[PDB]
Design brief:
The structure is cut from a larger assembly and holds chains A and B.
Chain A: H1 5-18, E1 23-27, H2 30-42, E2 45-51, E3 57-62, E4 74-76, E5 85-86, E6 100-105, E7 108-110, H3 112-117, E8 122-128
Antiparallel strand pairs in A: 1-3, 2-3, 4-8, 5-8, 6-7, 6-8
Chain B: H1 3-8, E1 28-39, E2 49-56, E3 61-65, E4 78-83, E5 93-95
Parallel strand pairs in B: 3-5
Antiparallel strand pairs in B: 1-2, 1-4, 2-3, 4-5
Classes of the chains: A alpha+beta, B mainly beta.
Chain B binds 3 RNA strands through helix 1, strand 1 and strand 4.
Pfam families (chain A): Ribosomal_S8
Family (chain A): Belongs to the universal ribosomal protein uS8 family.
InterPro entries (chain A): Ribosomal_uS8 (IPR000630), Ribosomal_uS8_CS (IPR047863), Ribosomal_uS8_sf (IPR035987)
RNA sequence: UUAGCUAGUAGGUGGGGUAACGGCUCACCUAGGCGACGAUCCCUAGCUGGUCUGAGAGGAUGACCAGCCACACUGGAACUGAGACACGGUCCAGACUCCUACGGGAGGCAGCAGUGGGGAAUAUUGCACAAUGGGCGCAAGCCUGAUGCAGCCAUGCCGCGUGUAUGAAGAAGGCCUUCGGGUUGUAAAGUACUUUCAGCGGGGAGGAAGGGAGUAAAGUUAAUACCUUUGCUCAUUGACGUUACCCGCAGAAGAAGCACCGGCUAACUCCGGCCAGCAGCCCGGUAAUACGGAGGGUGCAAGCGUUAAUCGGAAUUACUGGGCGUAAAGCGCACGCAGGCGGUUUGUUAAGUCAGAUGUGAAAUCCCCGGGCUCAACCUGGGAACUGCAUCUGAUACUGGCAAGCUUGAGUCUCGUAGAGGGGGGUAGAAUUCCAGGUGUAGCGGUGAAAUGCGUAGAGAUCUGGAGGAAUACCGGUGGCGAAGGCGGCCCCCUGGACGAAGACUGACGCUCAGGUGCGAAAGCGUGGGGAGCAAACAGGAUUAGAUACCCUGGUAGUCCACGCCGUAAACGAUGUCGACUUGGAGGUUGUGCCCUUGAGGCGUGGCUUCCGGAGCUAACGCGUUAAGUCGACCGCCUGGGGAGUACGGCCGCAAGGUUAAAACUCAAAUGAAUUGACGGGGGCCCGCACAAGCGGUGGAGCAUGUGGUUUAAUUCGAUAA
RNA sequence: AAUACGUUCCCGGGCCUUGUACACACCGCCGUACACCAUGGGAGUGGGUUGCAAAAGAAGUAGGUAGCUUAACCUUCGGGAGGGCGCUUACCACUUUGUGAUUCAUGACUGGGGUGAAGUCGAACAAGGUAACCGUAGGGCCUGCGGUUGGAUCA
RNA sequence: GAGAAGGCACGCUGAUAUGUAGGUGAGGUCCCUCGCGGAUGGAGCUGAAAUCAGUCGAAGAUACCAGCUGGCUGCAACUGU
């Protein structure tokens, strides 16, 4: 059954990017909206909107540059079968700093460099390169 | 394997079995020559390989090769064996030439230390 | 391939006991406690800081140095003491060794040397308490195999030396040579110079602080004695030791070896028969860079190699960091407990998580900057590090707990649909066989051909009636149903699942699942039936060199039924289950909705299903929305080929056997896909005196000629499409 | 001179396609005498370790004590308290018995396995000449039943 | 298989308890649809087994009474005749 909706969101983004989809839709969630915010403010997706009240539907507008995928790689790091938590001195850097690592710190969901500047660690949600 | 399957049963490191088990982690072992004879090689090769059977001090009875050209080895000869197989199936040890019963190969001038030959003084 | 263990056992009350809590012990009472997070049992093992390796994570390891523990011939016990159940104490028992006047005694090197033994292997029966430390003492001092040193060993690390400069037509000899020469090779000889280290002789620190005897000052005291502290003076304190270091002498004089040279791997020539031999993994059958020797060269160098052992390379146990369609690997299928994971919102907690601080993380070691040994090894100052644990204070995003929700996952209800889904009973027709009879006559049957076999006692053929069992032609179809195995005439009775339409309902009730349980083709087993056809075994006839086979004639078990067992299949999609996402085309089957329904119509929308194919993936073949694509959860499984799914042990079975499941040993391969050929007692097409149609021969005779064989002194040598 | 209808068969060749475990390439691999090595079973045989039920009871410690003895303390000088030895009980080591468990070595004989230029007799790979293989059963590999394609050819 | 094998305890006296647990059950009391009744009640009687302590003997199942045990194997299944 559906036991990891965040990995499902990442997989939907990856499959819509590989299929040259204009936008991807999925059931919404607070954590999904936070991760979509982190992706949009970093420039990996164009925009996102949440429609519906009793069954919210999250819709991400995918991004392309030269007819090519803006999101080259997106992986789930911390997963239900194995949780990955990191301290602020061992936060990972993707693509030697060119990529981002979505980290869930006690001050919300943010990137790895934002969590480093804030002096925080937490759960490594995903890698986006 | 799933992380849970490894938690329940971890990885089992493959154990390596020795190729010279009669030495018992010793560089050399002493033994008495039970029977000295010759053997024919295997397939491609064709010769009469000089070999001997030796009961070691730890009770092991093994067949050991006698390198070099010519040897004066009879039964009840107490020799020193070392690892090193002969590619002669079954033989897995070499006899140290120049070790307390096996005289060095006479008329050696090159690679003498491998056959226990004293340096010829000018 | 050890699943149950435990009777002082678990707890309680009370007495005792200990320095101290305590089943530590006793009496009684309660009936517990440990265990799948591995109790119990078995094998191995001192633990740590650390060491080796590794980029790291890890793997291996625990010698020296330091901390902890245990032991002191073996077993037991206590005594003294602050501390022991005591290496150089006590008592007892045992084994052993020794003294004895035979009555009794004595001893414990796993302290330092040392001996015998074992082993491949590990050293002196040395000097001094001079320094540090220890015991005793007011002190002097005595004791100290701790310790400081020395002896032996290339065992390791580090440093230095075995000379330096010049030196040719390039001497001799050696090796090679196309015989020109080349190389060894400035290498040598010769000449000039030098003397580190070793050898002989002469100087010479530092490790030395103290302690002693004197006086002087201060304190104490009634005292200018004695004592304590503090200055100064004098004579001394070194095992190492002939020290380190320095100076002088003489003379190249005393000092280079080991391995390798086919590829991996730096380094090539000559000479002597698959033998001798080499080999870490892939040479030698008469011009071997692979054997052995020589010349030359290469690499290390007071060392060099071989062996043994650990890690690396090995991503080859893959946490970092692997796989399971065909290379090893998806349980035959399903239900399901423990376990793992879990949609979405709010509040709360702060367990995981994160942040800060405190304590700790012994010293040494590792690393960084310096210092001292002439440098280095080594020693050492300071720092960093010790990635860990605990506590305290906060954060609340995520995971978890708690409380309340929500409907989209999961189920319930309503109405229908399709179906070889299952169990029970009945019945129908075609056909085979058999029994009886009629007609009828010489064959039938079978085969490549035959024969065995049946038949003149009337077969086979045909017609009529009857009996019995088994399976259900056509429909029928890369069609349907079922978790899988499987399910096929028609009818009735009982019964499970799936799907669709529109709603209502519950509100995470879910997914997966070790062990467990259930179902599980065929064959096989047990009991009782049944038995037409077919047909293991079996018999005969053929074929054949043989034919325990294929072929033929029969034929028992079995196949069939009821009830049990078996639990295995190429149980296959060689593809575990569940969920999400990702271009298409043509069909099949089964619902449902819309439209003058034009039509057996068109357009949507579900379920299952077949073929092709795009991106992607793959070693390739191929898979491709029913993935072998992109992901998530859980489970099973794999770690080279044999030995071997075997042996032993356990469980199961009536048995056959099933299941779990190694080891020694042995090889450098085993394997998958695809490629070029070759071949086929595979296919298609086509040629040739290839066959067919003919004519003339050869093989028989005599002779000519060549060969083989034999003979010989030789019957010269070669040719075997000879 | 004869004869040739024709390509069904023998041989050799050419082209294409298919299968292959062949590649000094079809004149190309399996299972039942000899030698060696490791190993299972095996009447037993000898050891190690260990469980249970007992017997035993040195020294020591502790409880009890009428026998012997006894400096400190008390006393009425008679003794007393206390102590010690001896005896005894409890615990307990060695040791002894009986019966099991497990491990090692061993054993007449026996079952397979592996290895070894060169021995004897004759299934797979092509449609391998009866397609192969899987489970099962019966008989110096074949046959029956079921299953798979990891079978070739199909005017 | 098995009573496998093997082992331990065993007399007497006292105490627990002037004789216990248990068995039996009077009087009494109560009820009764009344009798050879029911309930309660416990007097009296009887009485193991065990534990602890003591004690005698060379010996406590003391006499009579009352399995020998184990291992390998042939044959027959067995009780029977």
């Amino acid at each position: 059954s559906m036991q990891d909706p965040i990995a499902d969101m990442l997989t939907r983004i990856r499959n819509g990017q590989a299929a040259n989809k204009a936008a991807v839709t999925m059931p919404s969630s607070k954590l999904k909206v936070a991760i979509a915010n982190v992706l949009k403010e970093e420039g990996f997706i164009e925009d996102f909107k949440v429609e519906g009240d009793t069954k919210p539907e999250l819709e991400l507008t995918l991004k392309y540059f030269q007819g090519k995928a803006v999101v080259e790689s997106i992986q789930r790091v911390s997963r239900p079968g194995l949780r990955i938590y990191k301290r602020k001195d061992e936060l990972p850097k993707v693509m030697a700093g060119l990529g981002i690592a979505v980290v869930s710190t006690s001050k919300g969901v943010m990137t790895d460099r934002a969590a480093r500047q804030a002096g925080l660690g937490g759960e490594i949600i995903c890698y986006v390169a | 394997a799933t992380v849970n399957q490894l938690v329940r049963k971890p990885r089992a490191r493959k154990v390596a079995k020795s190729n010279v088990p009669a030495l018992e982690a010793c560089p050399q072992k002493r033994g008495v020559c039970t029977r000295v004879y010759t053997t024919t090689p295997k397939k491609p090769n064709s010769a009469l390989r000089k070999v001997c059977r030796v009961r070691l001090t730890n009770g092991f009875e093994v067949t050991s090769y006698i390198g070099g050209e010519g040897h004066n080895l009879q039964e009840h000869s107490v020799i020193l064996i070392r690892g090193g197989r002969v590619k002669l199936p079954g033989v897995r040890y070499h006899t140290v030439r120049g070790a307390l019963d096996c005289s060095g190969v006479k008329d050696r001038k090159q690679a003498r230390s491998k056959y226990g030959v004293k340096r010829p003084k000018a």
